[PDB]
Each structure stands twice: as structure tokens, then as C-alpha cells.
Amino acid sequence: MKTQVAIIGAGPSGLLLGQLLHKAGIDNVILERQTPDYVLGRIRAGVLEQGMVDLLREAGVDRRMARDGLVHEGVEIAFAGQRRRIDLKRLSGGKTVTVYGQTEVTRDLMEAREACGATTVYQAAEVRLHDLQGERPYVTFERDGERLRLDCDYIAGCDGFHGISRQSIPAERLKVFERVYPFGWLGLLADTPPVSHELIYANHPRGFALCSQRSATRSRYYVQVPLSEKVEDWSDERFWTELKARLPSEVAEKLVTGPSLEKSIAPLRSFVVEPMQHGRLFLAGDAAHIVPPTGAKGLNLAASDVSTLYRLLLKAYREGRGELLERYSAICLRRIWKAERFSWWMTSVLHRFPDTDAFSQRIQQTELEYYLGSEAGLATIAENFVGLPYEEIE
Amino acid sequence: MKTQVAIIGAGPSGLLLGQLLHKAGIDNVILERQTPDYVLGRIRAGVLEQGMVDLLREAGVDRRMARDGLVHEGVEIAFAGQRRRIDLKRLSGGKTVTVYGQTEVTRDLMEAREACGATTVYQAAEVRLHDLQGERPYVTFERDGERLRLDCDYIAGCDGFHGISRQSIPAERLKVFERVYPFGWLGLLADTPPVSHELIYANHPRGFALCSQRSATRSRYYVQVPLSEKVEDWSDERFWTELKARLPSEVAEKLVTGPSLEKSIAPLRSFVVEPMQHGRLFLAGDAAHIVPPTGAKGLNLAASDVSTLYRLLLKAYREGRGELLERYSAICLRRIWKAERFSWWMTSVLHRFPDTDAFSQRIQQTELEYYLGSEAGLATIAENFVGLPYEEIE
Ligand SMILES: Cc1cc2nc3c(=O)[nH]c(=O)nc-3n(C[C@H](O)[C@H](O)[C@H](O)COP(=O)(O)OP(=O)(O)OC[C@H]3O[C@@H](n4cnc5c(N)ncnc54)[C@H](O)[C@@H]3O)c2cc1C
Ligand SMILES: Cc1cc2nc3c(=O)[nH]c(=O)nc-3n(C[C@H](O)[C@H](O)[C@H](O)COP(=O)(O)OP(=O)(O)OC[C@H]3O[C@@H](n4cnc5c(N)ncnc54)[C@H](O)[C@@H]3O)c2cc1C
């Protein structure tokens, strides 16, 4: 088989890159390990940046998002008996964020790729990458027991944290930066109306809680849990009693509860590799970096890596400027590290940590009181939360 | 002996409280352990907030400060080969800071107290405080071997970190918050012209450096040093070679060096006690709290504790409103904890720490790049650095 760009991974990064590229006339094949149905079972993200909303419109896949996505103009933080609204729109200079589930975005891209007839191979087993510093890279994989070869000019590793393409770079050429946090998030999806029209992040003595949503009749809630926990110990009953105990009383009284559609625990991690490319392999999304879910930045950083890679591959194919591709990692990493610092900051001030002496507990509380009480403080949260601007380039 | 307010400590907190009170007609005695000359040997602070400048004018002791103090409109931070100016005046809404040495402020207050004839007992040995929850507190002390008693209505503990008055409160009534940092500052005073017209804080791989001043012909420099260091291992020569190595090359080339007038190491500490009062004893200044020198807040928090105590003692004596004194600690601690959080933040992003994994090193660098590159980021530094407004009260 032969193509121009081989994309490893059919989650949101690989599908959005594939759609952008197809629309500009650049042929591409996506290889995915799993089935369509397994990819669509993953709940994950709910919050999209405007930058991400504009990229879906650029890829022509925004009809359902513009109908069904909810635009949010603000977010609440609750701490020490008080609730504080951050007017994102006012403080960021008119930007907002959009709530539309990752499942939905992925289904829309999948429906779009299928219609235009572009290649996607699902159940592609044992993907291997070869001759990365050559002129002619190739990918081998197995389909129904026979080993096939796909020849390409470039490879985009969009295969998430446990994918083959970061593992295919000589470990000595990579610098890893990682922090593992001593807690996870227990998340619960329920077909119930959300308890507020905006998000509520809560710092409570028992641990963090977050109230979020998917639509007017579907809700998504999170509580901080130790790493030792397993989801079979948390009945629906136990989760709603614990959520209610971590919220302000006038918010817990209004809570409509109900059976879970989905329940799961996600560990919190920060992870960055430098560089994000090797020869003709370019990493994008969770393959190159992980942020804790607290700043809602993972899928949105995937969007700007993909946006930066699409514009540089377009310069390389339409305009013959293949040299501009060496700049991919420097351009992406400026943005990645600022969103990593915001996600770390949010995580630090909203969660209950283990080694906590009396001084750090009080500095944590005073960080919330300063940033939420000052107009300049509020603006640093708001501009980071809506998403810092993408780099123009050339 | 009998007085209205007994003040333990003749450093800047006790002298400024004493002057304010004398000027409003409220009699007061200051007791100091040391001699005038020992108190005047301490170099310490160089940066005063406007709030502090206005309080010295209110106490009538500002003639030399208005002549000789330098008003600064901005400050520089240097990190990773670049220098960034924070325009304090622009970003704080017109506030500036004033550079006038602590030695000078203290001499001016001392000269003022002497002239007006108010009581000061120096070499007051073994000060003890008695009957703190009574109607009639008293202080005993020794002068030339004989033990004398001073009767008073109130006692102000302005005796710094190692003073008797925090030790005189039942330990069970106090909550202590403390962080000890794994480094100190080696400071050097030299009769040389400053290397810049504004302050330069420098984060360097070898450790922190700070370029500061006392006048057009006197300079004060600091380098971060391990706690194991002793000042006799640091010759003038060794200090200037190390200062130069931590600065941008175009700043080290312009440096005029010279012999030290004073050299000393100061350990970095954060410390807060809650409450700041017990019965008829009120703590003020370093007796109640310590901040690391990095945000220039210690003497300025002493000024606002004293300002808050003077206005409440005035309501108690002129207006009979002695009940308003129970509010002293709650009013002071709102301000103390925000300046403690700023001083901790400055310390964290400007110094080289020991346990430093690759992720934290990069978050430290990204904090500097975000706060210094964003207008909202720059405004949070600038409003904290000029001093957050004092509480109005009643
Ligand atoms: C609890 C939670 C909440 C989050 N909330 C948000 C939020 O609100 N906002 C936000 O911006 N981000 C959020 N995120 C992050 C976001 O979901 C991810 O960053 C996003 O899924 C990244 O997409 P991706 O395509 O890079 O990776 P993935 O979604 O992981 O997809 C990669 C694909 O590659 C496939 N693959 C893996 N290995 C191979 C292989 N060897 N061969 C072939 N295919 C392979 C996988 O099967 C997978 O389909 C959240 C994450 C979690 C877990
Ligand atoms: C290196 C350094 C740099 C600094 N830079 C700045 C800066 O630029 N800006 C800023 O705002 N702050 C800065 N500070 C902090 C500032 O110097 C202090 O917060 C300030 O000295 C507090 O004044 P005070 O009167 O409360 O205490 P002190 O100055 O400590 O004086 C207390 C007095 O009480 C006396 N005393 C103690 N025990 C007894 C007793 N038992 N009986 C009687 N008398 C007693 C002592 O002899 C002393 O004279 C700096 C400090 C250091 C060390």
C-alpha cells in the first residue's frame, strides 16, 4: 500500500488531522488497534476551547456541535464555605469555552471520514514503524493474520500515551519530564439534569469535587479518590453521598441524582517529551504529552499540535517548503509548557494532598483567596482557562 | 513607674508605634534589651511601600526620607539569558516603591523620639510580662542590677523573632505555621555606585542574586548560599566573582566593585502565629510573623500592624471604644497571609532548590515566562510588589 501521510491512531487527534489533510488534497491512511465501538466507549473530555471549535469548523465537521454544544461564559470555584464566579467572557476579552463531549466530537469526525471515503484500517494489530530517518518510511501491521506494509512520506503518531510511536524513537534522543500525582479522579456519567448551568470546581477538606455536564439532560461528576481505590468499591449510592458531602449545601440540596451510565477512575499525571519529532515521525496529542484533567487542556493541546502539523505539512506539499517541518516541536512546546503550568497550578490549589503541613494548607487557601479576589488574579485564570492564543508562524 | 502603653522593643515597629501614639497624646515607654548603637548596626531592609512612606509622614518623621529616599517606578527580573522590566507604576495604577534603608528610618525615628522627650529605657535586661489577662498588666525589668516595675494598660510586643512577648503567651493558645528554606542570603554592603537605577532580581543556575541600593553612592548585593556557609569563608573577592557569575554579562561588565562595609548571612524563613494577641498584649512586626526577604514585605507588614494597632488604641483612648481591640488579629492576618503568599511565590520562582527533578525545574522556568510575558501576569506581580491596600475598618 502507498499513501502520503500515515496516521497511527483514530482517536480525536488522528481523525482531526486526517480530515484537515483530506480536505486540502493530501492523502492519508489512519491505522487503529481497536474497533470503532471501543474508541467510542471512552467518555473523557467535556470542555473545548474556541481554537478547537474553529478547527472543527475548518475541517467542516461542526453542524452538530453548533446545534448541541453549550457555550459557557463563566465557571465557579467553591472553597471554604464560599462560591466565586469567574466571568470568562468579561475577563478574557470576550472569549468563551464550549461544552460538547469527546465521544460526540469523535463520532462526528468518524461520520465525516466515512462519507468522504478516506482510508481507515481498524483492528490493525502490532503496528511497527520503520526507517524513520530515511526518504521512504514505512509502517507494517497485521490484518486478519497477514502482515502488510504501508509506504508513506511522513508518519503522524496520534496514538495516545500507550502507543507505539513514542516507543519507536531511540530513547537517548528523548528528554522526559513527569510528575505522578498521589490521587485519581472517580468520574460518573448519569442521565440527570446538571446541578448548575456552568461548571463548579470544589476544594473541600474531604477532597476535590467537580460538577460538569454533557447536555441539558446529561451530567458528569468527579470526586478525588486515593490511588488505592477501585471502581467496584464505589456503588452509585456511595458516590452521590460523597459528592454531596463535598459541595456547598445550597448546591447539594438541588442535586438530581440517578444510576450511572458509566463510572471509572483516571490517575492524574503530568508528562512532556522533548523533542516531539524524530526524522519523519511527528508526535501529536497524548502521544507527546499528558496534562491532569483539572485545567481541561489535553484534547485542546492535541487540537493545536494538529493545527500546527496540518499547516506545516500543507507548506511542505503545496509549497515545497519541507524545511519548515523542523520547527514543529519548538512551536508546539511553547504552548504545551504554558498549559502544563496552568494545569499543575489548578491541580495544586483544588486538591487535598497527603504530605500536608499547616503552612502549605494555609498557602493553598490564600492562593484561592488572592487569585479569586483580585481583578488581575481573575484575569490570569480566565485567559488560561479560555486558551492562550495559537502561534501565527512562518 | 506608670504609663499607658508599654512597648517592648526599639526597632522600627516599636519606635513608629511610639511616635504615632506620642503625637496623639497617648503616653508610652519603650523598653529595649540592647544599646542604641547595636540597634543601628543592623542593615536589613531597603524597600518601602507607599503605605509605609505615608505612615512616616503621619508620624512627622519624613524630612530626610523625602530628600534622600529614591522613588522607583520599576524592577527587573533576569532569567535564562533575558531581562524583563515590570513597570510598577503603569501596571499598579500609579503606585511606586521607595528605597531608603532601615538603618536610616530607625535613626530618624530615634532622633524624633529623643527630641520630643518621650521615655526610652535601653539596656533593659530580663524583661518579663505579668498579669496579661488582668486590668492592670505590668512589666518587670532590670536596669544596673535593680529590678524595676512598670505599670501600664496595654503592652505592645515589638521585640522581633527572638523576643520575650511571643514566649509569654500560653503555648496552647497559639497556632504556629512555619516553613524553613534550605538556603540563606549572603548580603554585602559597599560604598560603590549601584549597577542599575532599579533593582535586579536574578534567577541563575548557580543560585539567586539580587542587585539593590541605598543611595547614588552606596550599594547592597545578595547571593543565595547553602545553610552550611559561614561568612568568614566569603572574602570580598569571592563574593564579587560569584555575583558576576550569576548576572547577565552586560550587567556584570558595568559593575563597580569595592571593599565591604558590612557582610552577613540571613537564613530564609516563613513564620505566622495565630492569634497575634493575648489579653492586653498585642504582637506587632517580626514578633508575630517572618517573611523571606524576596518580596520585601517584613518591615512593610510591621508598618501595617502598627498602623492598625495605633488606630485601634486611639479609638480605645479618645473614644472609649476598647472593644474594637479584639478585632486586631483578624484585620492584620488578612494582610499578613497575602504578603506571605507573595513572598513564598517570589522565593519559589527565583531560587535554586536542592530536591529538584526535571519537571519542577521546567515549571519554575515556565512560571517566570508566563507571569512576565502576560499583562494580567505582570499586574499580579506589580500590585503585590507595591503593596496591597490597607484595610479601612470600624
Ligand atoms: C477524565 C478525563 C477528562 C478529560 N477532560 C478533558 C477536558 O474536558 N478537556 C480537554 O481538553 N481534555 C480533557 N481530557 C484529555 C483528552 O481526553 C485527551 O488529551 C485526548 O483523548 C487526546 O486525544 P488523542 O487522540 O491524542 O489520544 P487518544 O484519545 O488516547 O487516542 C489515541 C488512539 O490511538 C490508538 N492506539 C494506541 N496504540 C496504538 C497502536 N499501537 N496502534 C494503533 N493504534 C493505537 C488508541 O486505541 C486510541 O484510539 C480528559 C481526559 C480524561 C482521562
Ligand atoms: C536580609 C534582610 C532583608 C530585608 N529586606 C527587607 C526589605 O527590603 N523590605 C522589608 O519590608 N523588609 C525587609 N526585611 C525585614 C525587616 O528588616 C524586618 O521585618 C524588620 O526589622 C521588623 O522590625 P521589628 O521592629 O518588628 O523587629 P526588629 O527590627 O527585629 O527589632 C526588634 C527589637 O526588639 C529588641 N528585643 C528583642 N528581645 C527583647 C527583649 N526580650 N526585651 C527587650 N527588647 C528586646 C531587639 O533588640 C530589637 O531591637 C529584611 C530583613 C532581612 C534580614
Q: In this structure, are A21 and A131 located in the same domain?
A: yes
Interatomic CA distance for residues A108 and A112, integer angstroms: 6
CA atoms within 13 Å, Cβ hemisphere of A75: 29
Name the residue among B270, B337, B359 with its Cβ closest to that of A177: B359
Round to whole Å and give the CA distance between A244 and A85. Answer: 20
Closest CA in chain B for residue A93: B376
- What whole-number distance in Å separates Cα of residue A152 and Cα of residue B81? 41
Determine the distance separating the centroid of ligand 1 and the alpha carbon of A219, expressed in angstroms. 20
Task: Tell me if chain A has a CB within 8 Å of the CB of B367.
Answer: yes
A179 touches chain B (CB under 8 A): yes
A83 and A64 in one domain? no
Q: Whose CA is nearest to atom 21 of ligand 1?
A: A299
Minimum CA–CA partner of B370 in chain A: A338
B358 in contact with chain A, both atoms CB, cutoff 8 A: yes
Minimum distance, in Å, between the CA of residue B146 and any CA atom of chain A = 43
* Residue at B188 is within a domain: yes
Decide if B28 contacts B18 (C-beta within 8 A).
yes
Using CA atoms, how far residue A154 sits from A151, B126, B204, in Å, is 9, 81, 40
Residue range of the domain that includes A298: 1-72+96-180+269-351
Residue B394 lies in a domain: no
The verdict on whether residue B123 carries a ligand-binding annotation is no
The verdict on B280 and B240 lying in the same domain is no
Beta carbons within 8 Å of B218's beta carbon, 6+ residues apart: B189, B190, B191, B192, B194
The CA distance from B188 to B243, in Å, is 10
Give strand pairing partners of B98: B48, B71
How much distance in Å is there from the Cα of B284 to the middle of ligand 1?
54
**Cα dist. A288→A32, A275, A306 in Å?**
17, 9, 12
Full strand arrangement of the beta sheet holding B97-99: B47-48, B97-99, B70-72
Q: Residue B126: which region, alpha, beta or left (left: phi > 0; alpha: psi -120 to 50)?
A: left
Judged by CB atoms closer than 8 Å, whether chains meet at B340 and A358 is answered as no
User: Chain A contacts of B176, Cβ < 8 Å?
Assistant: 358
Task: Confirm if A17 and A23 have CB atoms less than 8 A apart.
Answer: no
d(CA B252, CA B246): 9
The reply to whether ligand 2 has any atom less than 6 angstroms from the CB of B292 is no
Q: How far apart are CA B238 and CA B235, in angstroms?
A: 5
Phi, psi of A230 (to 5 degrees): -120, 145
Does some domain include residue B393? no
CA distance linking residue A309 with residue A331, whole number of Å: 10
User: Whole-angstrom Cα distance, residue A106 to residue A115?
Assistant: 14
Report the nearest-CA residue for atom 21 of ligand 2: B299
Same domain, A333 and A188: no
Pick from A272, A362, A376: CB nearest B383: A376
CATH classification at residue A163: 3.50.50.60
CATH code at position A197? 3.30.9.10
Same domain? A326 vs A296: yes
Atom of ligand 2 nearest to the CA of B159: 34
Contact B16, B53 (CB under 8 A): no
Cβ of A164 below 6 Å from ligand 1: yes
Question: Is the same domain home to A109 and A256?
Answer: no
Task: Let me know if residue B340 belongs to a domain.
Answer: yes
- What are the chain B neighbours of A178 within 8 Å (beta carbons)? 359
| Beta carbon of A9 within 6 Å of any ligand 1 atom | yes
Pair A154, A313: CB distance under 8 Å? yes
Please report whether residue A393 resides in a domain: no
- State which of B55, B273, B286 you would mutate to test the pocket of ligand 2, scoring each by most atoms of that ligand within 8 A of its C-beta: B286
Query: Phi/psi class of residue B275: alpha, beta or left (left: φ > 0; alpha: ψ in -120 to 50)?
Result: beta
Q: What is the Å distance from ligand 2's center to B279 Cα?
A: 24
A190 and A61 belong to one structural domain? no
Whether A349 and A368 have beta carbons less than 8 Å apart is answered as yes
Residue type, B135: E
CB count in 10 Å sphere of residue B216: 11
- The rounded distance, in Å, linking the Cα atoms of B92 and B313 is 32
Answer yes or no: is B379 within a domain. Answer: yes
Question: Which structural technique was applied?
Answer: X-ray
Beta strands in B96-174 (DSSP E): 97-99, 120-121, 125-130, 138-143, 146-151, 154-157
Give the sign of the dihedral formed by CA B269, CA B275, CA B277, CA B282.
positive
Sequence-separated (6 or more) residues with CB below 8 Å from residue A326: none
Nine-digit cell string for A333: 512546546
Mark whether B124 and B242 lie in a shared domain.
no
> In what order do the strands lie in the sheet containing A125-130?
A125-130, A138-143, A146-151
CA–centroid distance for A191 within its chain: 23
> Is B179 in Cβ contact with A359 (below 8 Å)?
yes
- Please state the separation of Cα A363 from the chain's center in Å: 29
Q: Are A77 and A86 in contact (CB under 8 A)?
A: yes
| Residue B85 neighbours by CB distance under 10 Å | 14
Cβ B366–A341 below 8 Å, yes or no? yes
Residue nearest to atom 42 of ligand 1 (CA): A33
CB A275 less than 6 A from any atom of ligand 1: no
With an 8 Å Cβ cutoff, are B380 and A383 in contact?
Answer: no
- The CA B286 to ligand 2 mean position distance, Å, reads 6
Interface residue of A359, A365, A381 to substitute, partner B, most B CBs within 10 Å:
A359
Q: Does residue B248 sit in the same domain as residue B370?
A: yes
- Flag if A374 and B363 touch (Cβ within 8 Å): no
Annotated binding residues of A for substrate: 201, 212-214, 222, 293
Cell of A61: 465537521
Most distant pair of Cα atoms in chain B: their distance: 64
B255 and B323 inside one domain: no
Task: Determine, yes or no, domain membership for A121.
Answer: yes
Nearest CA in chain B to A377: B380
User: Is A234 in contact with A64 (CB distance < 8 Å)?
Assistant: no
- Kindly state whether A377 is in contact with chain B, defined as any CB-CB distance less than 8 angstroms: yes
Instruction: Name the residue with cell 496579661.
Output: B132
CA–CA dist B215, B210 (Å, integer): 16
Cited resolution, angstroms? 2.1
Residue A394 belongs to some domain of the structure: no
Task: Give the end-to-end CA distance of chain B in Å, rounded to a whole number.
Answer: 33
Contact B358 A177 (CB under 8 A): yes
Burial class from Cβ neighbours inside 10 Å (0-12, 13-18, 19+) for residue B88 reads: buried
Grid cell for residue B217:
553612592
The answer on A128 and A83 residing in a single domain is no
Whether the CB-CB separation of B211 and B196 falls below 8 Å is answered with yes
Note whether A254 and A113 are same-domain residues: no
Q: Is the CB of A347 under 6 A from ligand 1?
A: no
Spatial distance between the Cα atoms of B142 and B123, rounded to a whole number of angstroms: 8
Q: What is the distance between the alpha carbons of residues A61 and A44, in angstroms, rounded to a whole number?
A: 20
Domain count, chain A: 2
